[PDB]
Symmetry: T
Subunit: 155 residues, 12 copies
């Protein structure tokens, strides 16, 4: 069970600064924490991680997952959450569970961050938990897919 984790613009800069709202934990460290979570719960998942500052590369990537062996996507589209109708359209046609994560609470900052076109397209949205948000999303992804598979077999 391959889960694709997509990390949007500026997420690669975690650690390398603004620790007063994001922390000194890096993105590579968050990805280690996700692997730890997989093993600690013995969840049968194999993660692939992708970060980019390009809207088009996020779109290419979601598209590429269509009819691939990726069963689900966990995404933090970064500032593109608030602006990217194109990424939301891509999420809409993905044909699999997509879950949005934000490290910060996007209801609790500037007004321009409240809208998320991408989160409106996702099955579910997690915000405000920092790095832990991504393990939260892993957990949901497993339950969502297992549940979908029960509807498969028992039909």
């Amino acid at each position: 069970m391959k889960i694709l984790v997509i990390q949007g613009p500026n997420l690669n800069m975690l650690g390398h600064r603004d620790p007063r709202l994001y922390g000194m934990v890096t993105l590579d460290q968050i990805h280690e924490i996700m692997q730890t979570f997989v093993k600690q719960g013995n969840l049968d998942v194999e993660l692939e991680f992708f970060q980019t500052n390009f809207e088009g590369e996020i779109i290419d990537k979601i598209q590429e997952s269509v009819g691939s062996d990726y069963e689900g996507i966990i995404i933090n589209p970064g500032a593109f959450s608030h602006t990217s109708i194109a990424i939301a359209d891509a999420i809409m046609l993905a044909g699999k569970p997509v879950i949005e994560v934000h490290l910060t609470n996007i209801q609790a900052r500037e007004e321009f961050r409240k809208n998320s076109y991408t989160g409106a397209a996702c099955g579910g949205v997690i915000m405000g938990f920092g790095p832990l948000g991504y393990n939260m999303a892993l957990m949901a992804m497993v339950n969502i897919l297992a549940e979908m598979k029960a509807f498969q077999e028992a039909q």
Copy 2:
């Protein structure tokens, strides 16, 4: 470690109808699922559940948790999320982790549901996962408190 779970207006009507967006699982069933999660992960938590259709009873309850042995609150304020400045003010003065859950994705419905005064006051917000959202919040609550306790002891 007592965690208070507060469930707002109409949450008691889960099961008893609109299963086409909320499902036939009842609120009492969600609370059983949370207990199952506690035992299955052997988390040292003791939950207390409270449901009400009164804004004032949610406020009384959050207030009552101040300087009590409740260490955290998981809340689904229901339709009061979008309207209740009074509940948000209560959340602000609670002095402990508060986490908001919604069964549905509130970015993906009517425009009047997008605002959450209460979620803006909470540390973190979870939406769109159905019943599972509450186990997601349990998991965050444990990590948040454990982490706070590390900052306690190692200081």
Copy 3:
């Protein structure tokens, strides 16, 4: 038929002043008039009346009616019309006809009274007829419930 009549905040103050914008008839008198409209029409309708200033009591009451032997609700949610998404959510799950009444025309007053969340969730809305609006809702509820019965019997024999 048991019909439940819910009267929201400040409706109990009818005729205990503002005899200009609302008249000098009391809530108790309006309810008497409704009873008299049933009795006179020989309608098989038992009315039950509930006034409250509490949003949560209105939701409690609408919830209580689910799986009860109430066939319908006539509601004036008062000021909560404009603000209560919670009461609209309760109406949406009521599973029975709910008719909203306002004594005044809420299109013809302050801007803040124009939105009615509860009204939008109700099948039908009556406004600006004063106390008469409640007798209009009675007439409507009876006709709605008859229609519903005839539809239900005529489908069960097919």
Copy 4:
């Protein structure tokens, strides 16, 4: 009493399709039902019916009623509800009761249907009861006109 019943744009297309959002009863049938509600109630009421797709014909008609022997208007201005300040201006000078009816609940549809200029100028508004709304307006108009008569006689003897 002569009551004038004005039916605005596209109301003539009732039952000539969209049998889902509006039903399959025709405008002619609704008017028959209204006639039958008068006859059956032995109401001293003569109904006159007017449908038009023209804003100017509706205003002409409301104007024509001033100093006429029409005692009241029941109006469904259709889409002109939301846009016609001109028809609201005509209602405001009508000098007689005007009741607005909508078959559908205009609080529960597209945003552009929520404003009713004409509704705000009418004494009272009924919406979301389908064809029944017209019989509800009839009931109301009769009661309004009675009240008006009793008030007028009881002041002239004082």
Copy 5:
């Protein structure tokens, strides 16, 4: 010099009621007052008056004045001032002076009366003077046309 005076919806109801903001003077009386003004100042104008409650009849009429011997239009489009893009488009193509009159001050009533699509298309707008507004417009019309004729001859 023919001047067409166009009077919009409900103007025919002047006198016949709401004298508490419009007065007991009728529309036919305003048209007499305009003729009085023509003779009293010995202005070489011949007025034609047209009232209608139809948007389409106002449009037909303005159109009909194009390449006619009407040299100018004085118009009170009534409630169509606030709504009629079609009447404004007609005014725009009229090819002659058009002047808007309102009996009431439309900056000083409801918010829905503040916009005038038609007045924005007119050369000039007069409001708030009652019946006198129309003699004011007559006076401007004469000066405007005389001035245009000076630019004609002296070119």
Copy 6:
């Protein structure tokens, strides 16, 4: 196929004012060009032309097309595009393809021209090609109708 071409307010004034933003081609010339487009394509199309400055005349004509011999409508509602919910409602019940045409690009002018109630009710909208837009609407209409027909025989056979 009889196709109805409805032209809204002021369209009759083409080539008789504003050579700048519109053309110097008249409305009659546009209609000749459309006829020419049919005849030389040897299309089996009989065009019917109707211009009016009256909203209600447009609604009358759309209604008259219901259950008629007309298989489609090409419409430029003029300034009523932006204002007429009534005409949009008529389009919604037309029961046949309706194509909206504008000479000008309505996304690129005043803010008040951007909304088209009528365009949102139409299946397709063409704008900003000038008189050519109408021939584009003819091409589309023939193709829509041929596809619709091939579909009705595709289905009657399974």
Copy 7:
């Protein structure tokens, strides 16, 4: 004169959270200070205190004051200031002076705090003086009541 002091949601949490934006003075201490202000001014005022987190309890209390022994109300509706048309409606029918107090300046915080439905229904509003605001409301209330009374005897005598 009995004066009623109504304190809305969370006001009971003063001095038990957020020393920063509010004080460290408790609600009971504020109430002692008001009593102290009366007693030392030798004012003939009997204060009655009521705090609640329930909108409906506030409306109940305002209503209960109609035709009672209370001559005035000093109110801080808390967050319900910004949301409660219901409480504003209650204030409008109170029939006696109602003064709104806020500890903080509600013009100088979040945008959602700027509106006060309740303040607009009150005769006067005091904000941003902290606990002192309540003593200012006491001073005003005594002066309003004394002026009102002197006026009732000014008039009965001519």
Copy 8:
């Protein structure tokens, strides 16, 4: 019968430039044209003219006319029309006819010019006629005062 004519900010710059929307006629020339109008119609009025770029001087001036022998005010508050609640409050308490004039059509320019707080307080508003607007206002002022005087005497 003294009529005060108040001319607001930048009106003194008429002539001295932007003749492509205002013309080469100066303010002093407009005031001569008003005197010409008085004599030509033999109207018993004595005008006083005041121009200023100060909001406070317009307010002082309107105030000063209260209980003076000024019977009416014709005002072009300039850009202060759109912004000056203080000037509108002054107009409201003036106790005599006040008429607003604009040389340009303020419904037909930028959106920030559409509001006129001052015109909403005035009895009537004239726009879009250039210099002639002020003679239009003179004419209305005479009729308004004469009419008020008929209501005086015949009462």
Copy 9:
């Protein structure tokens, strides 16, 4: 303590127009009443009064108070409350307590009066008590200053 009282545009016209919404009490009378309030309270306060219709004169005066002998400002900026960011900026740098007063309740009039830039810059705002508001501002100012001073000696001693 010298306290400066700044009165904005049109405040000088009190009692010389609109007996209705304002009083019939003049501005000079209000100023006498304030002096009277000080003298009878045996407050050590020397009031200085300044009225102007000029925004820039208000800003000049607030600035002139910086590093002066004045310990506080009571201000009614009149219509400039709603418009003057410049005056709000001046208030922000004043370096001493500034209290805003309105005779009327600015939450309960036209929409354009609701914003107060100046009020948001002031520590506290009093509205809708009429001339009494000014005596309330005096009471508050003395109390604010006494508390501030007691604090400066509370701190120099530890």
Copy 10:
């Protein structure tokens, strides 16, 4: 004439998702149909196709067309229609006809799709005809180019 066809984000996913709102026809099939439309019309047109999910790749391509051999552009910018001022700016300096196409009617979907920055920069916009829209854009482009050319020789000769 070489005509460039630019297809924006997700257009490559046609027929590989959402048979409902779009077709089941693929992007390559649409491009074949356009080629077919040229060849059978014996048009002298050489089409060049470019799809990308990158805003900057669209801007690169429009720029690359400046002073190139391409005489026109047919563009569907996809979701960038609603967001991309950058692409609109590129269109504005393109120096040749640019036609915008949408498969769907963007006036009739979510509010966020209504604006098209790119459409307002284009000379003409076609929407809501599905894949046929592209052939309509081809017809228009040939006609625009032929008219432009006839004009350049109309003018060089006087």
Copy 11:
């Protein structure tokens, strides 16, 4: 060249506090720095400085410059940037280069500071560089005026 430097409301309070958001340099010091930037660059520029809190004095001053021997204006209109259509109107008729300066970045503060009417009328705007912004405007004005001179001479010899 004579360049006029206009400093609007509260700019005289620079360095007389808020040493945090604005710094501790005075207006007089900034003007000294500008003088020193001229002297050091051996620029043939005479600077004239004017500060005022009066909107009317700023307009007077800009008007006074018309037909004067001032070749340019550097203006910081302070809070009047956001509100003064009157000062923008004066700038528009100045007939010479006008550059707006703000010490702070007005895009990065309260919403009410984002609009600059005066800035929109100026050729160019500089913000968020503190006192340096004035030296930047000096550099720009010199370069603008040189360019203007070279253009004027090189056209007069053609």
Copy 12:
């Protein structure tokens, strides 16, 4: 000092047309002018230039500069100024001075150009001086960096 100069979408098209709204100087020429302003001022500044139409390349580039030997950024984000929260986020974490430049005055054009997310995150913004704006940013960056150095040395010896 190494200063990085980022030029956003369509800036490469300068002087390759719209010689009216933007002039006929090229991007390459502007960069030459900047180089010449350094050389002539004998500034110890090495300029590096980067143009791109890709939002992601601009973010990549700003990120690349973190922990590099670039001391500062001069940026014109072009149309991405108004839309890119992503580029603003990159600016906010740059940890070095970033100055925004626009050739045109973005307060004086379409409404959609008034917001600058990137500008608000930059320390300072320059607009409406054409190519000169870049030399103004150079002057500023040098002065900013000097100030920063003097501050840093004078604190390390304390």
